[PDB]
């Protein structure tokens, strides 16, 4: 147990879940998270973690999920989906959804995907989107609309047309650079009283990764 380059990497992983109403009510929401700390420290130091709303320990040199929280109040909803459905005869279905990014322009949400579900009397789907790239997968049955990367606070609409046939909510997905829970690693004091390497002598690394689990929005 002895390294020359002393580092450690804090992983704050999340999964923000949402449940909205066609109008705009947050019928349900919460986030589940665990913090993994990948370290390589010399000796057997007793640490001091920090954060918002601080567990002390002696890290199992290697990799170990420190704690694991699960907030439910005052949550950050990374995206804001808002659709518009217009009926006609029984021939066509007018549908326009719009996603919104609610975060610091200095951050890029990636791996975005909206799934606007169609009905079973579907004959053909037409769609246009100045941004992104979508298609109507008849098997899964929906208009998978994928987006490479999207900045924050910006807007983006996708207008489709479901050609009905004579005779569910829009799910979303996304990875982010920040933690929706609001959490934040304040400090991680590395202390091995035996050996000569200090705390402000270590290289600390921390990353925030928010995944979207159940981000459905009633149509």
């Amino acid at each position: 147990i002895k390294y020359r380059r002393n580092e450690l990497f804090l992983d704050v992983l999340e999964s923000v879940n949402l449940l909205m109403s066609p109008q705009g009510q947050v019928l349900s929401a919460h986030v589940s998270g665990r913090v993994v700390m990948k370290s390589y420290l010399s000796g057997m130091p007793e640490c001091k973690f920090g954060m918002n709303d601080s567990i002390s320990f002696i890290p199992p040199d290697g990799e170990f999920e420190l704690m694991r929280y699960r907030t439910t109040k005052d949550i950050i909803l990374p995206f804001r989906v808002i659709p518009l459905v217009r009926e006609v005869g029984r021939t066509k279905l007018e549908v326009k959804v719009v996603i919104k990014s609610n975060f610091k322009p200095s951050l890029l949400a990636q791996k975005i995907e909206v799934r606007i579900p169609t009905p079973l009397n579907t004959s053909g789907v037409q769609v246009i989107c100045m941004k992104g790239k979508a298609k109507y997968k008849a098997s899964e049955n929906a208009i998978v609309w994928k987006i490479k990367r999207m900045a924050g606070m910006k807007e983006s609409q996708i207008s489709a047309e479901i050609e009905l046939l004579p005779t569910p909510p829009i799910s979303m997905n996304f990875e982010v650079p920040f933690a929706p829970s609001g959490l934040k690693v304040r400090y991680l004091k590395v202390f091995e009283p035996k050996l000569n390497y200090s705390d402000h002598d270590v290289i600390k690394w921390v990353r925030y990764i928010g995944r979207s689990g159940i981000y459905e929005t009633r149509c």
């Binding site: 990497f9 890029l108 791996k111 650079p177 400090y187 991680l188 402000h200 600390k204 690394w205 990353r207």
Partner: peptide, 10 residues
């Protein structure tokens, strides 16, 4: 950036 780490501000 999504997996890129970042130095903490002690």
């Amino acid at each position: 950036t999504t997996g890129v780490y970042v130095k903490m501000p002690p």
